[PDB]
Amino acid sequence: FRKISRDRGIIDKIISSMAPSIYGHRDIKTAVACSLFGGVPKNVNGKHSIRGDINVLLLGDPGTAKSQILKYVEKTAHRAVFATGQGASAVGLTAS
Amino acid sequence: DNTEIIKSFKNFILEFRLDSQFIYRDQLRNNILVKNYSLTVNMEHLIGYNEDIYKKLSDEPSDIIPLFETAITQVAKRISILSRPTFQLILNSNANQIPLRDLDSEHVSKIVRLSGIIISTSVLSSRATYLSIMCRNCRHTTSITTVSLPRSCLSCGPDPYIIIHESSKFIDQQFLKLQEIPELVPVGEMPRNLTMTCDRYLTNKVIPGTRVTIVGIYSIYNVAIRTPYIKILGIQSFTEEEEEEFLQLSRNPKLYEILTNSIAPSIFGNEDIKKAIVCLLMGGSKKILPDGMRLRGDINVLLLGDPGTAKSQLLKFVEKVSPIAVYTSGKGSSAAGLTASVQRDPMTREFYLEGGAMVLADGGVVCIDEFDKMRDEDRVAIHEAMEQQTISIAKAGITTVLNSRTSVLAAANPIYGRYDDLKSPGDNIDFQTTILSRFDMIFIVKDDHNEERDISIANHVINIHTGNANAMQNQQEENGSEISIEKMKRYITYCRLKCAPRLSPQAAEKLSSNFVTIRKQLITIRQLEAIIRITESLAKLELSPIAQERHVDEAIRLFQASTMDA
Amino acid sequence: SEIHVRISDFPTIYSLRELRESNLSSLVRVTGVVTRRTGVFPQLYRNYQ
Amino acid sequence: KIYPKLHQMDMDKVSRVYADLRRESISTGSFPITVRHLESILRIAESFAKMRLSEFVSSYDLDRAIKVVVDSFVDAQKVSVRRQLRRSFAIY
Ligand SMILES: Nc1ncnc2c1ncn2[C@@H]1O[C@H](COP(=O)(O)OP(=O)(O)O)[C@@H](O)[C@H]1O
Ligand SMILES: Nc1ncnc2c1ncn2[C@@H]1O[C@H](COP(=O)(O)OP(=O)(O)O)[C@@H](O)[C@H]1O
Ligand SMILES: [Zn+2]
Questions:
Q1: What CATH number is attached to the domain comprising B472?
Q2: Which of A91, B59, B302, B408 could bond to B439 as cystine, CB 3.0-4.6 Å?
Q3: Element housing B273 (H / E)
């Protein structure tokens, strides 16, 4: 890990390795890459907290593999939970 | 042995003196004249008369406090002889109320002192205190004073006894729910709710949403599931130096500006918004006309804000400053739909009246977040409460009216991405225009692009992300730019309790001239009351006996900055 | 009154799909996610959950 | 393992771009730049540093962090406003 961490173009190797069999859409691939690594959460005592999670919205015309990206994120991420807008319910998301 | 205990309490009541009066005997005599069988005894006098009887009561009240109730019944009977049922004893104490988080197994069955707010009350129920029974087999008659009937006759088979109803006595019981004061509620923690039961004349003395002091008997009743409760024994609901401190502070000419800056120092700009919040916290004045018209003293303010304008922080800061404040967001309230409700508690299997967020804040302030996305039917109850200060609830065959004298701090998002000055607020704000007609003053917090403001805000973000914000608190305190939040909360309660201003004739004629000239250019008669409430708000801050015409200029300007903002 | 022993770093690890019948009445180590959790109540007393 | 931290040396690089971005918001476009955008820039800046397994935020990571957030904000605008903003932010 330390060896690759200091290699040339480490950020470009990461982004170009997001979804290898998807062409272009590099502004999404860089957005997918950043959402996987995430930020650093902060909690100031006696004040409110700050989230470190990165939120991505993929809006596009039919095609463009928006769904296949979420299928690639499901397998690569450590703990991935997949949901669908119509197949989910208010109880099925919050609690039972 | 127990006769000495009875005698000791008998001498204690008959002979204790305070203010040259035998207060416990006199008040019992007064209760007999009033024909109510109740007595109140202060624990701080019990220890003074004799520590031994106090120590016994504190250690084993299970059987000793029945003895006290029987002893005073004898005392009352003796008193009735001189003038020619089982009486109740109420305990009051001034000792420290141990936090509800601190009670442990070592205090089980011991006398404990607690404090909290009453969130729910149940319906009355009948309980037995004296019974007469008869054997079905041999007709043997006897009397009995969890008690159970004998399994064998005392003169017949198993369980031979039946109850004679026309020769028995019964008492009333009420179950209540209490939770700790919000001033001590930890962050990310649900406040500890507590089950409390009271009987005889202690019933129906309080309503949900009442702050009280509790003296009672902490106990537990029934893999081994157990549930605690308190047998209620008694319920109770400023320093000279602090009084003179604020009295001197009343003569300070810069108090208005000092208080204004202390309102959320971490936020930039919006100075007049801070003044409005102070007027919201100070509030107006309520008066009653002989013809049945009651004048609302509460002041409600709406803060229409664009996204990212720190609208969440504006309401968040107010809750910690106002002594009586509750935060609501996304239809979320104190386990209710912002209003009162009737729910069944399965523990006692009884039905309970439960107070909502607007119920708990009677006489205080409520913070409403996400106002544009609430339930419409909730708005109707809010609409009535915003004007008549009452909430109406109907259940089966009964309709009940509940008082809510609460000022409302509200924040909302416009219909579009940003308020457009070309349109009336009724076509820009994303909820019912009827509610828009009810707010006293609405402000549009702005996001005008400015170099030094944005840069100062921008650096503030990195300071938090670098942890330097903690050092900023010391720097701001050293600058003397803020009054202590606890002291300001004390001041708000102080002014709300000590001052009630009235308008001066010069201010009234000044208001009349302003109102006529405004309508000559153009505002409704309803908003005349809204402006006048501000005039009483400024005078209350200064604790002046009457309002003054010098309060009018700021009052008009702040309202002008509100209504003409839209 | 008692000293309940806490074992640590037990080497053999099983998943929720590997719990064979032969593993009954034996010490096992598994890993998972906390979905449902009950309250704290005494048991015939000492705490139970 | 990695929890990269900020350097106050980059405060100027962050604040000046934000004020420049804010100035163009009132100049052209209907979308007002909000503080949450700046909060988004720091988060993605930290994520870029976390990619290199470096405990401190570098200037290079901030440049790419500024590029992503500005590009998304520009691309979401209408066509008439979109072309004006692309020329104003050619440096970024
Ligand atoms: N940009 C792209 N490059 C390569 N293949 C693509 C691309 N966009 C779509 N596809 C093909 O289309 C399929 C994805 O379709 P789909 O997931 O339905 O897109 P969406 O759900 O966003 O409409 C994939 O099997 C992929 O092979
Ligand atoms: N004048 C200001 N002073 C201090 N912080 C500000 C100011 N204006 C904006 N902010 C920052 O912008 C953020 C606004 O977020 P917020 O308004 O709570 O989001 P939302 O609009 O979704 O409620 C806050 O974190 C705050 O720190
Ligand atoms: Zn009999």
A1: 3.40.50.300
A2: B302
A3: helix B271-282
Which DSSP letter does residue A95 get? -
Q: How far is CA D70 from CA A25, B449, B554, D24, D38, in A?
A: 17, 18, 43, 12, 10
Ligand 1 binding residues, C-beta < 6 A: A 22-25, 62-68
Asked if residues A2 and A17 have their Cβ atoms less than 8 Å apart, the reply is: no
Ligand 3 centre and the CA of B151: distance in Å? 11
B346-374: buried (b, 16+ CB within 10 Å) or exposed (e) per residue?
eebeeebbbbbbbbbbbbbbbbbbbbeeb
**C-alpha count within 13 angstroms, C-beta hemisphere, residue D54:** 19
- Count CB neighbours of B25 within 10 A: 20
> Residues of A forming the annotated binding site for ATP?
60-67
Q: Can you name the residues that pair with B294 across neighbouring β-strands?
A: B288
Rounded to an integer, what distance in angstroms lies between the CA atom of residue A50 and that of residue D38? 13
Nearest-10 crossing angle of helices B23-34, B61-83: 70
How far off is chain D from A77, nearest CA to CA, in Å?
Answer: 15
Query: Two tokens at D32?
Result: 């007002």
Give the Cα separation of C13 and C7 in Å (integer).
14
Q: Please tell me the experimental approach by which this structure was elucidated.
A: cryo-EM
Token pair in block for residue B260: 């204004």
Tally Cβ neighbours within 10 Å of residue B541: 22
Name the residue type at position B412: A
CB-count exposure of residue B284 (10 Å: 0-12, 13-18, 19+):
buried
Gap between the Cα atoms of B63 and C10, Å rounded: 54
> B193-199 and B227-236 as β-strands: parallel, antiparallel, unpaired?
parallel
B555 vs B272: CA distance, rounded Å:
11
Give me the domain span that covers residue B511.
240-566
C-alpha dist (Å) from residue B471 to B464, B474, B477, B494: 10, 5, 10, 31
B222 in contact with C, Cβ within 8 Å: no
Q: H-helix or E-strand containing B350?
A: strand B350-354
For residues B370 and B350, what is the distance between their CA atoms, to the nearest angstrom? 35
Q: How far apart are CA C23 and CA C19, in angstroms?
A: 6
Catalogue the long-range contacts made by B373-380 (C-beta closer than 8 Å, 24 or more residues apart). B373/B330, B373/B331, B374/B331, B374/B338, B374/B431, B375/B331, B375/B337, B376/B432, B378/B331, B378/B337, B378/B338, B378/B339, B379/B431, B379/B432, B379/B435
Pairwise CA distance, residues B444 & B424, whole Å: 12
Nearest-Cα residue of chain B relative to residue D20: B451
Q: What is the 3-state secondary structure (H, E, C) of B413-443?
A: CECCCCCCCCCCHHHCECCCHHHHCCCCEEE
CB B274 less than 6 A from any atom of ligand 2 = no
Do the Cβ atoms of B374 and B358 come closer than 8 Å?
no
* Resolution limit, Å: 3.3
> How many A from CA of B166 to the centre of ligand 3?
20
Contacting residues for B288 by C-beta, under 8 A, at least 6 apart:
B294, B295
Residue B363, phi-psi category: left (phi > 0), alpha (psi -120 to 50), beta (remainder): left
Tell me the H-state helices in B196-254: 240-250
**Phi/psi at B444 (5° precision):** -110, 100
* CA proximity to C43, closest of B229, B219, B225, B220: B225
Decide: B181 and B115 in contact? Cβ < 8 Å. yes
